[PDB]
Symmetry: C3
Subunit: 336 residues, 3 copies
């Protein structure tokens, strides 16, 4: 079980909301799984009015990509901070043990890279985020977080030990954003990342976000970018929030099996209407679709969802089942 | 199990905080349980200073009445929107599957009605609320929500499978309200429902409620309207919050058995001091009273309870038990 | 089991973050455990800029000391309100049954004392706090709360019934503070406790704390006051929040066994990254350290932790384990 003598394999990451190909149950023994990520500081448009955010990312996306391994594997990560960036970064994995999650060993300035290895000995969905000494909250709320999923080697199980299987996995990162407003009542636009600092920290101290978005912008998971599924398919919905609580709900569906604290050695709860992800954690839910149609997935503080942006769509094909729900009489004039 | 061939029965609903008569464990087979609700838009007084709210309700109350059925039954609801109302409404049941909880099939304008049927296949306490496209948060925080309780056919059980029974059930809906203040520092009073819209949405965006009330007003469950019980009685306390988290506590008592996520196929937790209802869900707790006296039931963010209004009273008759608690020496001067 | 015929023993309390000496598993039968606490109203400095708080305490500390007994014991407490204080106080134990937790029987004015006894029949960590009629939120957020820990007579157990043992226990009280700012943008300093009242209640109503501290001040658990442990030691971390939610996280570690609702008759959850303490409750977590180094323990809303103060340090001695984590390549220039 000395990692230096195990087989090494390289994985290619994919952008959210997809998750890279992987096995659930596996017959493999432990290995060293190698990953690479590159930091990207960039301005982005987060809404339909042109509001911008001076963002900081892992691999260009919010959230960063999901990494998937099995309990007992070793994660080997090369973190690259290109010289086009202006700030120093690092990475803290909540799934790792020691040295502030690895943040003490991965401090890279622009133009540097570093390589860390850690044993993934605990199963579950865990957050990873940047955490530079003295600038922690700002790097996290500007985009620097993602999920590491450590599956049990035997796959997911229900409370009685029966196997659970998913057909598709989707990853959703939810981000509370603090965009300053100027004296004319409009959101401010900054020329550089450093310029946004001072106004931004003052808005963070009110504890009131201007916007709360799934995957980088208002409406990111709607229209042509909605998630897709069919009747009879089982989906795994991974949800991460690295700084603030959230309470996910699928309108028209449920959480058939949910790990709200996200740790797969504990039994899941069933039939949930709305579950709770603690700020600084990732959780997971399974659902098998039984009816076709458009579904909304959102934070069930409804003001956060519909006024501030934390909502997305799932578009599901198949045949309608009148035994589960039926319109007995359509809307019509009250009888006189 | 085709609902068109099952026996149909009509139920008469009662106003909160009572719950309509029902069986716990039952020997009946599945049936179609028919209900009717009528929407009422009305101005109400929510506090002792005369502050009003341009409210929207189901059946005239906040919360709407609790509906009770058994797992495997079908719920058939006729929703009536009278022509005295000004807005369109609908209903989303978190306990149902498909068509946005039934909201896509129940869109009624003033002067219309519609009838929906759905299978109640999952046990637990679930929220139901209005959800009109583009106006969701406003209809919910103005009053439009209630609870649907789906009991297991065998009644409630503890973690080891032993039967649990309640003598009385009470339903509490908790509502975060966003009442705008004018330039003189006083709360505004609006002539019509539509006029309150624009100021109200601006207060919702701060995420800071002006008031947080149980059942429609500050002090609704105090004085002559306090809940009542006696020593040795077991009560079921159902608590719903359709938009914001809350953390219920019984001062002087406990939660003997609690389902905080509200889903009866999961084992309850015991001996809780304070539990947690996620915004967009209903939960339930059982308690057997052992001491007489006045008890307070409240949201244990104490500022929310005592400054903003989220607190109520339970008045309990019976005999005091000095083995559980005894005053050894009453307040007296410190000995010199 | 008549408490008047049981053996009585007096315990001497210690200041947080330590906990008074006690047994875990015990062969003793029930007893009456006697404690004394004295109230102290005092001004304190809570940060490095000189900001003061007109505070109210139990025994001079925030939080008050942790009291430890075993399930079935009786707690006998003498509460003393010295005549140097200006206000009336009392105590509500969430672990007790009846008379508003004992608050109806312990109303002491300055110059008075009173003695209460109650059966500790439910195991777990429970909050105790002051609760004077009409002034409840203010006495609690000014400092008046602590934890009562009721251990099972057989000690802590895992979900399968296996014994769990801790080598050290630490108690952390987290306090949301509402310090008013004057017209010059600086925090106000008050000559007396009564003078702070009116400005303070207005800040409480915004629901936005100015500061959120562990054990009385920003940086209380850092530097020479950091908590200490060694590799291989198992620590019990007790965390109380009497008014507002919090979400504890150990950077570089985990919660090996956690009771987030704090009630030891329920099975713990394992491998948690971040857990959740409901406002108005205390919870507990166990962790066995595997790596040496400085660890941070904090509220994982990172703005609350690093901008408002809710963070502390644990300093751990021992030998580094490269099989759990290893730096493969230190930060260096990207290869060209
Ligand atoms: Cl919804
Ligand atoms: Cl209380
Ligand atoms: Cl952290
Ligand atoms: Cu960074
Ligand atoms: Cu973290
Ligand atoms: Cu409506
Ligand atoms: Cu809903
Ligand atoms: Cu007091
Ligand atoms: Cu309390």
């Amino acid at each position: 079980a000395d990692a230096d003598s195990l087989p090494h394999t390289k994985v290619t990451l994919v952008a959210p909301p997809q998750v890279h190909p992987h096995e659930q149950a596996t017959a493999s023994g432990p290995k060293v799984t190698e990953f690479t990520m590159t930091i990207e500081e960039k301005k982005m448009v987060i809404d339909d009015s042109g509001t911008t955010l001076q963002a900081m990312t892992f691999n260009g996306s919010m959230p960063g990509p999901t990494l998937v391994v099995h309990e007992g594997d070793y994660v080997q990560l090369t973190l690259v901070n290109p010289a086009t960036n202006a700030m120093p970064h690092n990475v803290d994995f909540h799934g790792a043990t020691g040295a502030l999650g690895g943040a003490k060993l991965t401090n890279v300035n622009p133009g540097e890279q570093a390589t860390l290895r850690f044993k993934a000995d605990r199963s579950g969905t865990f957050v990873y985020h940047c955490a530079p000494s003295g600038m922690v909250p700002w790097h996290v709320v500007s985009g620097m977080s993602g999920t590491l999923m450590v599956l049990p080697r035997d796959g997911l199980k229900d409370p009685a030990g029966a196997p659970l299987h998913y057909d598709r996995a989707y990853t959703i990162g939810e981000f509370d954003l603090y965009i300053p407003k100027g004296p004319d009542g409009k959101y401010k636009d900054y020329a550089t990342l450093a310029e946004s600092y001072g106004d931004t920290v003052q808005v963070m101290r009110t504890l009131t976000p201007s916007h709360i978005v799934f995957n980088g912008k208002v409406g990111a998971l709607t229209g042509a970018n909605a998630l897709t599924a069919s009747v009879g398919e089982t989906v795994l919905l991974i949800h991460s929030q690295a700084n603030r609580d959230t309470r996910p709900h699928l309108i028209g569906g449920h959480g058939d099996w949910v790990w709200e604290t996200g740790k797969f050695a504990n039994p899941p709860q069933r039939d949930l209407e709305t579950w709770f992800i603690r700020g600084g954690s990732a959780g997971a839910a399974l659902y098998t679709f039984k009816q076709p149609g458009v579904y909304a997935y959102l934070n069930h503080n409804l003001i956060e969802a519909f006024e501030l942006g934390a909502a997305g769509h799932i578009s599901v094909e198949g045949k309608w089942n009148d035994d589960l729900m039926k319109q007995i009489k359509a809307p019509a004039p009250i009888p006189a």
